[PDB]
Structure 1
Amino acid sequence: MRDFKTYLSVAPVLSTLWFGSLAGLLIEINRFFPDALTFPFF
């Protein structure tokens, strides 16, 4: 229903469903690794 060469719109602040959430999933990485200050690698 969405193929090739840009799509459908969206509101003024879907940024408030982008600050809240996405970014929100990141506390979700900041407790899985409840900590940082350098980091091991994969």
Structure 2
Amino acid sequence: MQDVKTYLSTAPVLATLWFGFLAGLLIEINRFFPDALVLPL
């Protein structure tokens, strides 16, 4: 974890973990709030 977490903090893994979370969030926004063309707020 002095070097395992260093590998986990690298540029491709952190891009995979962020965009996995980012596309995971935007899909789950698009399930409970789908077809969103106009922001009502």
TM range (shorter): 0.5 to 0.7
Specify every segment of 5 or more residues in structure 2 that has no aligned partner in the other structure, as ranges.
Answer: 1-5
CA RMSD of aligned residues (A): 1.7
Pick the structure with more helix per residue. 2
1:19-42 deviations in whole A, cap 9, x for unaligned?
A: 11123211111111112111211x
How many residue pairs are counted as aligned between the two chains? 33
Q: Which runs of 4+ in 1 moved over 6 A?
A: none
- Aligned-pair identity in percent equals 70
Q: Which runs of 5+ in 1 are unaligned?
A: 1-8
